């Protein structure tokens, strides 16, 4: 059973992954790093799920890493010389990066719905998601320099590739200052702001349901190629897209869409097969 | 004598490429994919053209792909097994991507001037242009998921590389929702919004004239290197730029400009040779 | 020491690099291209410096390149044939690019504080800095096309990688038009605008002091990995980050920062060792 | 009705492309650069061809570029300044590189069968082919430095990627010395050496027939992925291969081969559909 | 433990991974693809192992993939349309690639000791190992085209990156012909040939023991950086190497190795800590 | 004055760089790492030099690093915590890599002429050279694992990219065993073997003179593009080659070569201008 998160079926095709340690403001304890990997690897193979919503139980999205677990992991490493310590740490860092890379490698769209603070590992988490919504009281903080380290589980790799303003990204990173909702929306880190958590969740789940109404081949192939396209040249990415759609265009999802158009039936009334 | 587009000389150095099937809302049919390649390949070799404006005839920029021409192209493919159908489809996708890659590979700046809807293939087109202007009634839609396929002619590869907000790009792509002019300006997809098509085209042709008054070596070398720099690291791009300008700095265009500066002569009075 | 710049110790750990030819509007003459390289190479090895502020003396940040020196270097080149001229120009361009590349390769965060005009070479300089602030009267101009050349000392390689709106980047580059402070803030080129130079400098120095109060290992490792991550895929950048932090997490800065957090003390109360 | 080459059907599925200006030792003149592009573009779309053999008519494979056609192309270029001459030359070089890039971009295996000298442009040609055979009297020469230029139509990009010994490649390139058949076999530039042209062409057409007896999906997908794998990391190349074979494994070519294996039927008796 | 392989501790620090279905000529059935991944993932974390030897039990190294299992997995796929079939096959191919990729990602050197036939999947396996030895009766065959598919589990991505002669690589791939031991040695595919399996194994184990007598930090860091350097530019690889050795040079293995050199003692006389 | 090397003018256009600490078998002391950088940076800018020969004074090419200097550099590093030690070591490693990278970044061809042992840093040196010749008594040794470290100054980055046999490269690296001349020639690491040092040097200088007789624009542009081509795809490298030769074909070196051919004068009688 997951002890640090809770996964529920919100509605057809939609999975809700909720950070669930509210008494610690969803701090990321050691086991969370394994649990979120297990969770998203399962979601990736689940043929019924078409979209994911991520939120936090309690008063805020996440306070970030569990500082005592961090201290045990990093300040008490095994190894009888510095090279052997580094060998251990490289494996540790690589394993913790996987906690948020599984979100990006999940072909289903993942929607983060943030309320209150989203601190430290929270920003690494949400920058690996596809769509980000927040509440008016939310705030974001690349807290790691205040802990004595450069963020290593995805923020520096992905945050600069989800918004345009690099001066702001650098200021947030080097100072660890909070960015409140108004500025988060202005920056584009979030694409919508809601007055409270209930209204935001309603909108997040309505978005996930709308995505789930569409062909899953088209939606999940879109995510896959948006991610490929971020990291490769336009020409390399067009070449990959032709190699991708030479099989994916051979789908009944297009046949059904064309049949609907000919019959003058809205596309939301089509049923697509599992993926 | 094109079937789907019309190319005219607007004014000195400026070509106007107009999508021209107004009775069919400029739907992109079979000939369109071949003709835009022919058109921009000729523009690229045209030593008198320094800038291009692209617009649509009739009520809207484009309704996108012609669905029954698409059904013919994709739903009745030749091939006696899936691998052979995929062979055919890979070639088709590759050819149709070239329709918009030729805009990027044309060294002259290309300005898209959108009025009304710009749907599906329309967003693949405008995201391959350099500068985008639109009217107050314009709207943009990454419609492909509603037809059962991930966009494959450029939107996924270029759209996220022309605006900063990746949460918004992902929402647009997975939902196929319309983005209206105000939001398109806010996102930076378009540079300027105008009240109506006439005012927009006046400003687009004024922008094209202004660009055409500049050294063509400087302007077209700037487009070539901005594109190279998007796809390569800064250090690789600086190395390429040094190899580029070791030839291109050997021009009378600079000597003329330094001489004008020395005499206190406006740089707008200088005439530059063809390119 | 220097002919074209002046370097002062503003406050603990902060260096102020001031363009210092106010009677010539801080034009970038031959000495400037050599001196900035010497300066930032020394700052990169200075174990007491943790942050840098760059500003200009007099009326404006910079009028840009000295055209007379440029013509001597570029319109009067050694070389008895075009290939031999190009061999010399390749090296010249490479050396002038280094003037601004040393700002990016300097591990300390560099804050540009712009007042009045920032023209041509000034945009190449500020787009190699990390954080950009300006005054209400500032303006920015990618002036190179008006001189007859595509900008080659950094703007084309870095400006599109510091802001999201590529339509604006292309319009600024191809027309060489001025972008004023309100639009610079809107575009994200600058992340803060101030009423005057004094207020701006007070905030830039306060920002530099805040940054300098943090672990230098964490801040400088953050800059190094933000730059690496811009130019590589997310997966390559995560791999690099694990190989980086397998040594950099082995620091007393974590114990010190965590202890301070436990006692509710600020970063400024901690003494981190030199770097 | 080519002026510089001749294309014939050797036998089922095999095309023979012969350099055909024997009175001028198959010198590569102006029409040759255009015609080899036309020829291989047609071969690439020819669903009956599965393999190609390239040879030269007359006394030798090729003497290389036609020097007085080269003088015309390069020494009398249009352009009223150096930058404009370079614009013209970049386009020329790019077009002439396509003459040999089309061989690599053709998915059918291309076998070069060299007798006598293979000089300058000859090495750019054969290094773009997949398999190389030669006669005992054959010789290879990277002659370009003796004409005053670094080879630009493929040798420098491909030759070091078809043999292992980089010291030898560098010596050949900087000295322009001839490499004879024995050394060409030892270096691995050629796979097999034959006593005379007739024996070599028999073996080249036997090799082409053998390749043509195999599944064309398997053979041409193997060439496409060997080329992709040369230019990308192993992990990027494995990812591309999975995206390629998720379509291409859906073929009757495998079902037929497993069925033959089940019955104990030679795999040489199977017939495969066109591609 | 395993159904298709057997793992034994040969001698101190050396593990022997033996393909172990001798009655079936070590055919690679469904279990094998899972088991090799489990095996090398465990060896990668085994702090006592420093080198691995891979061999096959019975008459031959391996006959390659089990065709019946392959047909079940590949000619009988789940999926109600071609796109959904491809979605499943992409994952299948990706998982089978991991079977051999874990050998490359294992930081310990892996020595392949081949006797008799090494067919199809066997070449994919040995081209992911580091050092290859064979017997006089061994032979190698890139058999996949004879099954109707382009090899997808590593040969095309790694074989051309382990030997220099690309004409030979292409001939072997397109014809599926056998390459015997003398030619395998000549090509560099194997670096040593032995008269029989016993003599070969004695030398492979002696090599593994020699390797294991060296600092494991130095040897495993050497493999990691040889692999990184294959896939990146020399400049990127040098940068990575400096970021790697800034931790790995901080080891007692240097003091120990240098002290032994000063006393004229061999590596085997030193005790290096586990890794 | 260089204390660890000696540079002489061997003959017109040829520079001889000789390792010159023969009483220590040319061991690489601390200052050598700076001296070779100063030396090749000067040679790179020297317009009279067209080729370089590198050899060692005394009984052998080089015994490799000075072990006591290594111990002082690496085993006595400054820094009050492991991260600050790593900061120092990264800068040290980067600086020592430059010692051999300057050889590759020198546009003139560099010929290594090895006699006796070429140990440790000797292999990093010669693998950065372009052409390698040796004597019958020579031997090569990737000695670093015997010292407790993975080679970091170029061998792992370049050795695998100068020869084809990766199994041999891995065996040499992991065991640190010697490779004698016969095997070095067979591998292709050297391209010629001579009976003794005098005969080898005569041949090295005759090769350097032959290279120096050719156009320096063609020779040095060839080196530059061979190196670019090793590290980039063929398509990227052809694009760079067109951008390179759009200026370099505009040389009198080609005019003179064509005039010689028309006059029936051998090309070795042409005089080319300095570069
Ligand atoms: Mg609980
Ligand atoms: Mg805004
Ligand atoms: Mg129906
Ligand atoms: Mg002066
Ligand atoms: Mg079974
Ligand atoms: Mg001495
Ligand atoms: Mg050999
Ligand atoms: Mg003469």
Other Cβ atoms less than 10 A from the Cβ of E94: the count is 18
Structural element, H or E, at residue A161 = none
Look up D79 and say whether it is catalytic. no
- The label of the residue with tokens 């791009």 reads B237
The Cα B169–Cα B164 span in angstroms is 9
Other Cβ atoms less than 10 A from the Cβ of A217: the count is 30
Of C45, C80, C250, the CB nearest to F83: C250
The Cα F270–Cα F262 span in angstroms is 13
Token pair recorded at residue B129: 């242009």
Nearest-Å Rg of the Cα atoms of chain B is 20
Resolution given for this structure, in angstroms: 1.5
Other Cβ atoms less than 10 A from the Cβ of D263: the count is 7
Is residue E171 within 8 Å of residue D131, measured between CB atoms? yes
Cβ <8 Å between B273 and D82:
no
Strands (E), chain C: 5-11, 14-19, 51-56, 110-114, 117-119, 131-135, 139-141, 178-180, 192-194
Is residue E90 within 8 Å of residue D246, measured between CB atoms? yes
Q: Distance (Å) from the C-alpha of residue A84 to the closest C-alpha of chain C?
A: 10
Token pair recorded at residue B240: 């390429």
Ligand at minimal distance from the CA of C182 is 2
**Does the annotation place B66 within a ligand binding site?**
yes
Chain D residues whose CB is inside 8 A of the F219 CB are 145, 150, 174
Cβ <8 Å between E81 and A252:
yes
Nearest CA in chain B to A241: B152
What ranges in E106-134 are assigned the alpha helix state H? 121-126
**How many C-alpha atoms does B192 have within 13 Å on its Cβ side?**
18
> How many angstroms is it from A22 CA to the middle of ligand 1?
7
Binding-site residues from annotation of D for substrate: 63-67, 121
Of E230, E238, E255, the CB nearest to F101: E238
- The label of the residue with tokens 């950048």 reads C237
Whether B243 and chain F come into contact, CB under 8 Å, resolves to yes
Token pair recorded at residue D166: 């980089």
Ligand at minimal distance from the CA of A256 is 3
> How many angstroms is it from F19 CA to the middle of ligand 6?
10
**Does the annotation place E189 within a ligand binding site?**
no
Whether D191 and chain A come into contact, CB under 8 Å, resolves to no
Torsion angle defined by CA atoms of residues C10, C14, C19 and C22, in that order, rounded to the nearest 10 degrees: -10
- With vertex at residue B121, the alpha carbon angle to CA B120 and CA B126, rounded to the nearest 5 degrees, is 105
The Cα A249–Cα A227 span in angstroms is 19
Whether C232 and chain B come into contact, CB under 8 Å, resolves to yes
Ligand at minimal distance from the CA of E185 is 7
**Does the annotation place B65 within a ligand binding site?**
yes
From the list F45, F37, F51, F50, the residue with the least C-alpha distance to F5 is: F37
> How many angstroms is it from F272 CA to the middle of ligand 8?
12
Of F87, F94, F167, the CB nearest to E162: F167
Annotated catalytic residues of C are 65, 121, 124, 144, 152
The Cα F215–Cα B26 span in angstroms is 57
Chain F residues whose CB is inside 8 A of the C77 CB are none
From the list B100, B102, B112, the residue with the least C-alpha distance to B42 is: B102
**Does the annotation place A19 within a ligand binding site?**
no
* 3-state helix/strand/coil string of B115-138: CCEEECHHHHHHCCCCEEEEECCC
β-pair type (D14-19, D5-11)? antiparallel
Mutate to test the interface with C, among B160, B188, B206 (most CBs of C within 10 A): B188
Is residue C25 within 8 Å of residue C84, measured between CB atoms? no
Q: Which domains does chain B have, with CATH numbers?
A: 1-212 (3.90.226.10), 213-275 (1.10.12.10)
Residue C56 bridge partners (DSSP) = C19
The Cα E58–Cα F207 span in angstroms is 54
Torsion angle defined by CA atoms of residues C245, C247, C253 and C254, in that order, rounded to the nearest 10 degrees: 60
Cβ <8 Å between B150 and A248:
yes
Residue D53 bridge partners (DSSP) = D16, D111
Is residue B242 within 8 Å of residue C90, measured between CB atoms? yes
The Cα A201–Cα D261 span in angstroms is 58
Is residue E137 within 8 Å of residue E160, measured between CB atoms? no
The Cα C212–Cα C79 span in angstroms is 48
Mutate to test the interface with F, among D71, D83, D145 (most CBs of F within 10 A): D145
From the list F148, F130, F136, F4, the residue with the least C-alpha distance to F62 is: F4
Chain C residues whose CB is inside 8 A of the F248 CB are 83, 86
Angle between helices F30-45 and F67-75 (to 10 degrees): 100
Structural element, H or E, at residue B3 = none
From the list F231, E144, B272, the residue with the least C-alpha distance to D221 is: E144
Given 3-state DSSP classes, what are the helix, strand and coil percentages for chain C, each rounded to the nearest 5? Answer: 55, 15, 30
The alpha carbon of residue D20 and the mean position of all alpha carbons in its chain are separated, in whole angstroms, by: 16
Chain F residues whose CB is inside 8 A of the A82 CB are 82, 85
Is residue D144 within 8 Å of residue D164, measured between CB atoms? no
The Cα C109–Cα E73 span in angstroms is 55
Contacting C residues, span 48-87, partner chain A, CB-CB under 8 Å: none
Ligand at minimal distance from the CA of E30 is 5
**DSSP per residue over B162-230, as a string?**
T-S-HHHHHHHHHH--EEEHHHHHHHTSSSEEESSHHHHHHHHHHHHHHHHHS-HHHHHHHHHHHHHHH
Q: Phi/psi zone of residue F120: left (φ > 0), alpha (ψ -120 to 50 degrees), beta?
A: left
Residue D140 bridge partners (DSSP) = D118, D179
β-pair type (A117-119, A131-135)? unpaired
> How many angstroms is it from C28 CA to the middle of ligand 4?
10
**DSSP per residue over C10-43, as a string?**
EETTEEEEEE--GGGTT-B-HHHHHHHHHHHHHH
Look up D121 and say whether it is catalytic. yes
Task: Write the residues followed by a gap in chain A (C–N more than 2.5 A).
Answer: none
The Cα F73–Cα B25 span in angstroms is 73
Nearest-Å Rg of the Cα atoms of chain A is 20
Look up D119 and say whether it is catalytic. no
Burial readout A133-145 (b: 16 or more C-beta within 10 A, e: otherwise): bbbebbbbbbbbb
Cβ <8 Å between A84 and E251:
yes
> How many angstroms is it from A186 CA to the middle of ligand 2?
5
From the list E58, E186, E52, E59, the residue with the least C-alpha distance to E125 is: E52
**Does the annotation place B224 within a ligand binding site?**
no
């Amino acid at each position: 059973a997951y002890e640090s998160i809770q996964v529920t079926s919100a509605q057809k095709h939609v999975l809700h992954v909720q950070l669930n340690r509210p008494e610690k403001r969803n701090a990321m304890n050691r086991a969370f790093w394994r649990e979120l990997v297990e969770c998203f690897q399962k979601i990736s193979k689940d043929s019924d799920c078409r979209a994911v919503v991520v939120s936090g139980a309690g008063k805020m999205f996440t306070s970030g890493i569990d500082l005592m677990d961090m201290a045990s992991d990093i300040l008490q490493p095994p190894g009888d010389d510095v090279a052997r310590i580094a060998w251990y740490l490289r494996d540790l860092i690589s394993r913790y990066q996987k906690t948020f890379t599984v979100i990006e490698k999940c072909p289903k769209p993942v929607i983060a719905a943030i309320h209150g603070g989203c601190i430290g590992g929270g920003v690494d988490l949400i920058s690996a998601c596809d769509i980000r919504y927040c509440t008016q009281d939310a705030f974001f903080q690349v807290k790691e320099v205040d802990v004595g380290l450069a963020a290593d589980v995805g923020t520096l790799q992905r945050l600069p590739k989800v918004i345009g303003n690099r001066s702001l990204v650098n200021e947030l990173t080097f100072t660890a200052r909070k960015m409140m909702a108004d500025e988060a929306l202005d920056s584009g880190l979030v694409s919508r702001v809601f007055p409270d958590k209930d209204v935001m969740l309603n909108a997040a789940f309505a978005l996930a349901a709308d995505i789930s109404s569409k062909s899953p081949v088209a939606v999940q192939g879109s995510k896959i190629n948006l991610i490929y396209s971020r990291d490769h040249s336009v020409d390399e990415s067009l070449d990959y897209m032709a190699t991708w759609n030479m099989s994916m265009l051979q789908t009944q999802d297009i046949i059904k869409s064309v049949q609907a158009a000919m019959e003058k039936k809205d596309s939301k009334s089509i049923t697509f097969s599992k993926l």
